[PDB]
Short mmCIF file of C-alpha atoms and ligand atoms in Angstrom, two decimals:
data_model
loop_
_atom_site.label_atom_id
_atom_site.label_comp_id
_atom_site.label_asym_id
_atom_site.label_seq_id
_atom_site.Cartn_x
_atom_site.Cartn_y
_atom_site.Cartn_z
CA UNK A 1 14.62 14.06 6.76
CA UNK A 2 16.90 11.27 4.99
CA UNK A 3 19.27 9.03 7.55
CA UNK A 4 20.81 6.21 6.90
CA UNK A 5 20.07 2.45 8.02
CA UNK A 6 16.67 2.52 6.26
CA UNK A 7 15.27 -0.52 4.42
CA UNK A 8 12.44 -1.26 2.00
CA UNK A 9 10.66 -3.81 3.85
CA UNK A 10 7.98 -6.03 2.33
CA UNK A 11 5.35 -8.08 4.26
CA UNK A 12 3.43 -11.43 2.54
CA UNK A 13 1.85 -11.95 -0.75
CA UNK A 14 0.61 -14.27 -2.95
CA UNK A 15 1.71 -17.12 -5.32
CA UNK A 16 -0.04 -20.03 -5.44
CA UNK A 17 -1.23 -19.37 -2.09
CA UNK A 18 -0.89 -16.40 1.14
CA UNK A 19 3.14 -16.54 2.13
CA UNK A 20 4.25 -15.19 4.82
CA UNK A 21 7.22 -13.83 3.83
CA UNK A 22 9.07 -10.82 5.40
CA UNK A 23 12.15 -9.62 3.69
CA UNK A 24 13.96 -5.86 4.07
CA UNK A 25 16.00 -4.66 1.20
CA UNK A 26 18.97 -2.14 1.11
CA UNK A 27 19.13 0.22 -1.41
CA UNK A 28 22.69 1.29 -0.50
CA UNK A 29 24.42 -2.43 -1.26
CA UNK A 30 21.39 -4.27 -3.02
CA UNK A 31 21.21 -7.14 -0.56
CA UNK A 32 18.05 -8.59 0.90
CA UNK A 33 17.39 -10.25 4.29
CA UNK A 34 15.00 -12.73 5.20
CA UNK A 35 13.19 -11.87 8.93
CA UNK A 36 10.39 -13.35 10.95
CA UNK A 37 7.40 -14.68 9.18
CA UNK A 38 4.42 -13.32 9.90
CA UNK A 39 2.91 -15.87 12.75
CA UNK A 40 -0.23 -15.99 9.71
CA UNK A 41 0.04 -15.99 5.76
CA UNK A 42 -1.44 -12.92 4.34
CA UNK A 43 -1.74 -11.36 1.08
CA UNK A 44 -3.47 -8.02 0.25
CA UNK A 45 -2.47 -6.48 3.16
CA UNK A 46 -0.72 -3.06 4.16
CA UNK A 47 2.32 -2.34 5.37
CA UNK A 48 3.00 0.87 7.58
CA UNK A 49 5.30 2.32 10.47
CA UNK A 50 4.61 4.22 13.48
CA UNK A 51 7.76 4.81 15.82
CA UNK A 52 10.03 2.72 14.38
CA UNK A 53 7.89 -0.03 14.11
CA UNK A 54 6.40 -1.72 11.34
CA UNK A 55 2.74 -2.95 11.39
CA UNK A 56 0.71 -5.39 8.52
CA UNK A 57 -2.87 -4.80 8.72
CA UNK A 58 -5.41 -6.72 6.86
CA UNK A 59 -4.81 -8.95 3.87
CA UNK A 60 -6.78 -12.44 3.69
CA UNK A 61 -5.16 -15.99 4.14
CA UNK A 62 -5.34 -17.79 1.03
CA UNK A 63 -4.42 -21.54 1.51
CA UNK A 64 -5.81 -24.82 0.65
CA UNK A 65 -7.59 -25.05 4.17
CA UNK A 66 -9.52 -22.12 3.16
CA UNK A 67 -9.57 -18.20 2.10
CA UNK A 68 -10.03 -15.92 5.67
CA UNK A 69 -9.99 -11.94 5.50
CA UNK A 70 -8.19 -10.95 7.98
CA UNK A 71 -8.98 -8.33 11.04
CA UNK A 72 -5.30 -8.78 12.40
CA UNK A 73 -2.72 -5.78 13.05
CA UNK A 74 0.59 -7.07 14.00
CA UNK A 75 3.62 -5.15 14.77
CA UNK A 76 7.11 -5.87 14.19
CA UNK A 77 9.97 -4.38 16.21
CA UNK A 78 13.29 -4.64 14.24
CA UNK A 79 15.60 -4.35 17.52
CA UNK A 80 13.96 -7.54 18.48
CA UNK A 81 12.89 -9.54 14.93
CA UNK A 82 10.07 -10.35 16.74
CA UNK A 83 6.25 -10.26 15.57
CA UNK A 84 3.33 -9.31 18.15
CA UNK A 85 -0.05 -8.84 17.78
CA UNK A 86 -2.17 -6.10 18.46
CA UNK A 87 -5.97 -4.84 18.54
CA UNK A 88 -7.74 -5.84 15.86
CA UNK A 89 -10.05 -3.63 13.46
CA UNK A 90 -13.45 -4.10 13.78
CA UNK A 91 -13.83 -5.75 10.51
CA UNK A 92 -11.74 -7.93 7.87
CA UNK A 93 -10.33 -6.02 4.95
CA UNK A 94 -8.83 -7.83 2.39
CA UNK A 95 -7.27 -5.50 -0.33
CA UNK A 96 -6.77 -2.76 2.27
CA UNK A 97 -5.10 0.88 2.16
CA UNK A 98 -3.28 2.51 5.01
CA UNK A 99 -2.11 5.36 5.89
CA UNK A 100 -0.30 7.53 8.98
CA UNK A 101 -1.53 10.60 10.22
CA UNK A 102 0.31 12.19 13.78
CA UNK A 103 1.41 8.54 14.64
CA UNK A 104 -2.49 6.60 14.18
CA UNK A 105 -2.97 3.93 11.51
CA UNK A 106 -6.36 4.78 9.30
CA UNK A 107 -7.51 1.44 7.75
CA UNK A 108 -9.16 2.22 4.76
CA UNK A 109 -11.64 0.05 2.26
CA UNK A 110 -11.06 -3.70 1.42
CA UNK A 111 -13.82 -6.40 0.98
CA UNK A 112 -15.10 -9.10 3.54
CA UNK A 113 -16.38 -11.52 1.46
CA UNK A 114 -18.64 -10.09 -1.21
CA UNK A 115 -18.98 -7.03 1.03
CA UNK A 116 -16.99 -4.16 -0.39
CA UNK A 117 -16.38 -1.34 2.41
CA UNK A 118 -16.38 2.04 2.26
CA UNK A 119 -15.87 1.94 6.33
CA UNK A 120 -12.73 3.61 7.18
CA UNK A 121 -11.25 3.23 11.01
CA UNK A 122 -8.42 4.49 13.16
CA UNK A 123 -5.69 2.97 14.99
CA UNK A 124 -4.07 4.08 18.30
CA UNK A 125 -0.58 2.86 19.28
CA UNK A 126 -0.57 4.10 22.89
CA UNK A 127 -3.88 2.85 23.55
CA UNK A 128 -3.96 -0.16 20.92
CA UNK A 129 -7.71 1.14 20.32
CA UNK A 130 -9.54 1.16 16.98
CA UNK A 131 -12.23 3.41 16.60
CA UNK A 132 -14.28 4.15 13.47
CA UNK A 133 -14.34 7.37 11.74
CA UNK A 134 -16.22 8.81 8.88
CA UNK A 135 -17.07 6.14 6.21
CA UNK A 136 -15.53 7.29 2.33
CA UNK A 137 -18.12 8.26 -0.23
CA UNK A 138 -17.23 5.30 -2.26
CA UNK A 139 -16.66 1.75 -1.32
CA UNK A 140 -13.35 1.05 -2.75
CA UNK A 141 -11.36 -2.15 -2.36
CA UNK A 142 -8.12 -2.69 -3.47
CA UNK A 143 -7.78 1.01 -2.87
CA UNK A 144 -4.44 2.99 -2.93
CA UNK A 145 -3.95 5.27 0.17
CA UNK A 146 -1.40 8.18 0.86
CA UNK A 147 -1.06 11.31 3.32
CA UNK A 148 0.08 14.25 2.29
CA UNK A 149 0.23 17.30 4.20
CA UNK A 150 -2.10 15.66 7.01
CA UNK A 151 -4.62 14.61 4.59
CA UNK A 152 -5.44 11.28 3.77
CA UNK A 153 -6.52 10.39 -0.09
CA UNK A 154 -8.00 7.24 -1.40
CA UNK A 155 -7.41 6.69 -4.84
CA UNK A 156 -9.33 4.12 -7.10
CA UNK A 157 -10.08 0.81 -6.57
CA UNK A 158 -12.95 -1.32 -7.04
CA UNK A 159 -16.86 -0.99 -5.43
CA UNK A 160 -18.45 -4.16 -6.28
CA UNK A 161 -19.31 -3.27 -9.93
CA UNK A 162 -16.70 -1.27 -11.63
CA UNK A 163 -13.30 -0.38 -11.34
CA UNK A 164 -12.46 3.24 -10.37
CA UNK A 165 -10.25 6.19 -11.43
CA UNK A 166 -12.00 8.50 -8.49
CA UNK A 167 -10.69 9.30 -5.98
CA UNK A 168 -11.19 11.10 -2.51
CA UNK A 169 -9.82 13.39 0.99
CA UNK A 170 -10.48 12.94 4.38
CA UNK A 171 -9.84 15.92 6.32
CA UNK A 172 -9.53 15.22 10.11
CA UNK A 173 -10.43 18.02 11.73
CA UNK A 174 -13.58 17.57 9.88
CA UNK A 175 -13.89 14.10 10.20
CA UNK A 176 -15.72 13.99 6.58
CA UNK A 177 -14.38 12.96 2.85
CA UNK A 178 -14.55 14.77 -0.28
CA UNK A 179 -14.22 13.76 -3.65
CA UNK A 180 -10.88 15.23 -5.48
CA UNK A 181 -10.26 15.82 -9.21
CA UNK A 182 -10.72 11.72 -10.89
CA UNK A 183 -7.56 10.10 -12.15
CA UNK A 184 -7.24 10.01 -15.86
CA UNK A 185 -7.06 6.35 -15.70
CA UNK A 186 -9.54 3.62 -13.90
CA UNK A 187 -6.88 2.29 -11.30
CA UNK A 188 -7.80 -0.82 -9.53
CA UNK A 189 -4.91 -2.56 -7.26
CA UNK A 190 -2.58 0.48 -8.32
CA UNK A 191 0.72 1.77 -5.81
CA UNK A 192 0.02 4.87 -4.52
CA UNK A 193 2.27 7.30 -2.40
CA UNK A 194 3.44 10.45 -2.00
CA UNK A 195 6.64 12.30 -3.32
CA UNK A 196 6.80 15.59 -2.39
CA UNK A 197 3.47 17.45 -3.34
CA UNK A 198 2.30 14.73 -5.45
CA UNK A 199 0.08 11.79 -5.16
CA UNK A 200 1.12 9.07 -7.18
CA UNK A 201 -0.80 6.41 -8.77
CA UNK A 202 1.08 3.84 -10.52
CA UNK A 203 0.19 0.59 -12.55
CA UNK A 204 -3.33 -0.87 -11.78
CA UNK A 205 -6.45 -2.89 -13.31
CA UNK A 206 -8.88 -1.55 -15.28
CA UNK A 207 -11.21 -4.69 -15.62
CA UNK A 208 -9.45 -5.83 -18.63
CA UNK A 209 -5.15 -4.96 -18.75
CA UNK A 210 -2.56 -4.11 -16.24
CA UNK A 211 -0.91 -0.40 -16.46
CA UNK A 212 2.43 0.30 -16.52
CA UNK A 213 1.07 4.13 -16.93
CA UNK A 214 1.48 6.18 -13.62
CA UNK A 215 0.40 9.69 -12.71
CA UNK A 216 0.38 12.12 -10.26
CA UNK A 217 -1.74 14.38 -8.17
CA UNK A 218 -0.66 18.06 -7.43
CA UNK A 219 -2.60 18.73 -4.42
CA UNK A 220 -2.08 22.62 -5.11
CA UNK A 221 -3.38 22.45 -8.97
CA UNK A 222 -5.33 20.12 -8.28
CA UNK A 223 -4.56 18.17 -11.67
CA UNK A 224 -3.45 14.77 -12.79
CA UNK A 225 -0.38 14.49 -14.95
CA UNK A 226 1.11 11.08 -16.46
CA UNK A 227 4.46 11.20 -15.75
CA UNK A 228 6.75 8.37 -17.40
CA UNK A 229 5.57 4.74 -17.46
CA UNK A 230 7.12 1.61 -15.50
CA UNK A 231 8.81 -0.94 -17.64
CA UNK A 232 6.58 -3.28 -16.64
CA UNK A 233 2.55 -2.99 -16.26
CA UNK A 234 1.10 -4.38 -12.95
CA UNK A 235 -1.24 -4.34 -10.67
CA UNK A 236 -1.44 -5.72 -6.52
CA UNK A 237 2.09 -4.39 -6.33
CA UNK A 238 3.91 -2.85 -3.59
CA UNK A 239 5.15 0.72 -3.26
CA UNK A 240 6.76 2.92 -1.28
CA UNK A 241 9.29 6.27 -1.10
CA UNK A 242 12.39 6.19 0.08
CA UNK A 243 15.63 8.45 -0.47
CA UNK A 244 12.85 10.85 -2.57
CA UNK A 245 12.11 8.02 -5.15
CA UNK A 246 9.20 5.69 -5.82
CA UNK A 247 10.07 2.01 -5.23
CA UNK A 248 7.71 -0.36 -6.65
CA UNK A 249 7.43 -4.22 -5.97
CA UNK A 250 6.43 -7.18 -7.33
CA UNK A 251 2.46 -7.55 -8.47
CA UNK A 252 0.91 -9.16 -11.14
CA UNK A 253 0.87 -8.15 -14.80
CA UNK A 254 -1.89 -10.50 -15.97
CA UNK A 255 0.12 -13.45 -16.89
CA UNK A 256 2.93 -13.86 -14.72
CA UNK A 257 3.98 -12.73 -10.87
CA UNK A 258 6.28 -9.90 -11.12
CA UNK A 259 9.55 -10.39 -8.96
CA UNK A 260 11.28 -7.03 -10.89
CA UNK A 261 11.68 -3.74 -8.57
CA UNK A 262 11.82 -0.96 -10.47
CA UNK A 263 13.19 2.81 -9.09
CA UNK A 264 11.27 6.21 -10.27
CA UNK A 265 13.77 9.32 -9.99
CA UNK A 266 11.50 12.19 -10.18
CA UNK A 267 14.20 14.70 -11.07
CA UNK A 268 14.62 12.81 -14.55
CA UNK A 269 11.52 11.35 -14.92
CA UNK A 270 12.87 7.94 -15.57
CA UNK A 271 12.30 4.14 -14.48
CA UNK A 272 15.00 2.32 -13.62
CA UNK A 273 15.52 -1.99 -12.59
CA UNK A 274 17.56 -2.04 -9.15
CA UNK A 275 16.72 -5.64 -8.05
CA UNK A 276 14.47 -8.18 -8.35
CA UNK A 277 12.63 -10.12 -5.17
CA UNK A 278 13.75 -13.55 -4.20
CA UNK A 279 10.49 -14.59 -5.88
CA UNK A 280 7.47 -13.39 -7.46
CA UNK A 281 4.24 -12.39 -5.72
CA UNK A 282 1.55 -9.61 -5.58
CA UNK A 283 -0.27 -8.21 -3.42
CA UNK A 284 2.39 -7.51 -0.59
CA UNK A 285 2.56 -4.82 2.26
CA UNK A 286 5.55 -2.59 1.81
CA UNK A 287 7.02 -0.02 4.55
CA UNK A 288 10.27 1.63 5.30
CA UNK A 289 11.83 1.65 8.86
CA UNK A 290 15.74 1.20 10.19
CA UNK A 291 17.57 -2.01 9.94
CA UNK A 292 17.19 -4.75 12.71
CA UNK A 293 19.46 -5.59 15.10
C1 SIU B 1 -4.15 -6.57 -3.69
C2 SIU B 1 -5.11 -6.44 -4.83
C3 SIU B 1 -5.61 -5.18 -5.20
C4 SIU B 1 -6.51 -5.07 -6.27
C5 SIU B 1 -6.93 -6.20 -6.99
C6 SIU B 1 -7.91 -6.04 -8.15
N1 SIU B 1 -7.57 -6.91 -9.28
C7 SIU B 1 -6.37 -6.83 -9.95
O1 SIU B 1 -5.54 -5.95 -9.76
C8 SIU B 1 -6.15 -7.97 -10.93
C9 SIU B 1 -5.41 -9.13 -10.30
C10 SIU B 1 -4.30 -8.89 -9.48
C11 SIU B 1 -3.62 -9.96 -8.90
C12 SIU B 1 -4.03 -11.29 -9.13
C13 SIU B 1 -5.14 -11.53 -9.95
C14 SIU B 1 -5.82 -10.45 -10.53
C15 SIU B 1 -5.63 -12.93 -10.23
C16 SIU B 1 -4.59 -14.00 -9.89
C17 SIU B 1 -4.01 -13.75 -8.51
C18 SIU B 1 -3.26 -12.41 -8.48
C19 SIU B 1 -9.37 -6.26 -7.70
C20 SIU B 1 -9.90 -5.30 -6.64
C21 SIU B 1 -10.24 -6.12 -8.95
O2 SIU B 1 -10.25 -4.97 -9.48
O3 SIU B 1 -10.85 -7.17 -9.32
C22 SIU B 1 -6.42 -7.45 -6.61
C23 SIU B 1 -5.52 -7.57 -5.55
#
């Protein structure tokens, strides 16, 4: 499963305003390089890759001409540094979740507006088709989405009114959602992703603080358990696995825009400071794929 030539790459944000940043990291020598902006600013997107590529979905433009949630999937090719867009979904989602299942993007949640979705659609590379599937039980935006073993899981988030440590399956052969065992913590704008039978949810918003508390799902026991806590508490960060440990990125911690990256090793259970970003923002889309060209 592990090869080499893999970067962390990270897609927009926010500071002051929607960048449109894309920069790839490499956990091997601790460097970072700077690739092709997005052709539009987004923040509160999601990053994922399907074949190599790497595709943003969603997110909102925040700028001083205006705030626009965004429909937009674009697709980067790293033999080519090149940005190209694709289908759009059939909605905006700002504050999205994604997640890959047998090569198709599922779009999950975000808000249009004051509208807070629970609608859930699927992405098609060889076709670049969307078509909608089975909505969630809860509308959730800022949601955290993973797959594990096939399955897809949406975990927390935020419906409108209150901030949520629920969380939910979508089984595809089924093409329906069910509600899992809730999160011991209300989780709103948390990282979530998968290390080997686990779901993890770490950091968040709970209407009032950031969390630097994470904790994980065993899909077999079907239990939550807190495992150790980030250094730092945030929430509209960026996450993602790679070299079986949790990488999170950036967010926002209340007061200040995170640029620290801290490391979770799972075999000792401890948080570690690799790097920090070239700057600080939140609410970026974070994916692994090889190095460009
Ligand atoms: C991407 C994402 C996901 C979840 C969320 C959720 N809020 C937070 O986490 C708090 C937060 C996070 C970042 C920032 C601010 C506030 C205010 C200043 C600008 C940056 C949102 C759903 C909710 O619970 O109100 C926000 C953003």
């Amino acid at each position: 499963a592990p090869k080499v030539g893999r970067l962390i790459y990270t897609a927009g944000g926010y500071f002051r305003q929607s960048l449109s940043y894309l920069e790839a990291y490499n956990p091997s020598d601790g460097t970072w390089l700077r690739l092709a902006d997005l052709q539009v600013p987004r923040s509160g997107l999601a990053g994922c890759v399907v074949g190599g590529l790497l595709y943003a979905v969603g997110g909102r433009n925040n700028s001083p001409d205006g705030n626009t949630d965004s429909s937009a999937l674009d697709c980067y090719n790293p033999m080519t540094n090149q940005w190209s867009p694709c289908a759009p979904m059939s909605v905006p989602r700002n504050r999205i979740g994604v997640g890959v299942i047998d090569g198709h993007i599922y779009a999950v949640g975000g808000s249009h507006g004051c509208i807070h979705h629970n609608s859930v659609e699927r992405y098609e590379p060889e076709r670049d088709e969307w078509h909608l599937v089975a909505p969630m039980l809860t509308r959730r935006i800022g949601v955290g989405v993973a797959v594990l073993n096939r399955l897809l899981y949406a975990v927390g988030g935020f419906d409108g009114t209150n901030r949520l440590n629920s969380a939910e399956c979508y089984y595809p052969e089924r093409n329906e959602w069910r509600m899992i065992t809730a999160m011991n913590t209300i989780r709103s704008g948390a990282g979530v992703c998968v290390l080997h039978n686990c779901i993890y949810a770490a950091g968040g918003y709970d209407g009032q603080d950031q969390l630097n508390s994470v904790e994980r799902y065993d899909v077999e026991t079907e239990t939550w358990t807190f495992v150790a806590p980030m250094k730092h508490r945030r929430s509209a960060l960026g996450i993602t696995v790679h070299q079986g440990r949790i990488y999170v990125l950036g967010g926002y911690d209340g007061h200040t825009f995170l640029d620290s990256v801290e490391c979770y090793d799972p075999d000792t259970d401890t948080w570690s400071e690799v790097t920090r970003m070239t700057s600080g923002r939140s609410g970026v889309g974070v994916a692994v794929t090889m190095e460009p060209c």
